Symmetry: C3
Subunit: 56 residues, 3 copies
């Protein structure tokens, strides 16, 4: 069981109540108001406002 | 590998063809017509009509 | 931890840059422009244009 990340996509994300950006994370899904990322072994939901998707 | 749940959100869900509600479950994703929940070690997709999302 | 597939749904999917169809895969989620499938132990995101969802 493994969640293959969207190729050529890295995300920097801001956890609630912390201005420091974390990453780079892998993008697993992109919704209307949030995105799913995998930071190493942690998969989290991040509102788009707290995400910086970066193409490659 | 772990799916971190949406904080301050618990869901009660109705499996197809069973009126009894199950839960409380953790909310992992919220779409237009369905929601993703994690009931212990089981992650399932539940139509919004069969879900009771409860904020905290 | 397990991702229960949408019942009565099998998907055939085309990986980017390969015309050969793979499957059958299990449907885990259905979005606006893409779908989430599980091909054995691999969970991938597939644009709807590269997916053949088949009801049962
Ligand atoms: Ni998983």
């Amino acid at each position: 069981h493994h969640h293959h990340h969207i190729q050529n996509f890295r995300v920097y994300y801001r956890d609630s109540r912390d201005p420091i950006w974390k990453g780079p994370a892998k993008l697993l899904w992109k919704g209307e108001g949030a995105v799913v990322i995998q930071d190493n072994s942690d998969i989290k939901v991040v509102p788009r406002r707290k995400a910086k998707i970066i193409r490659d």
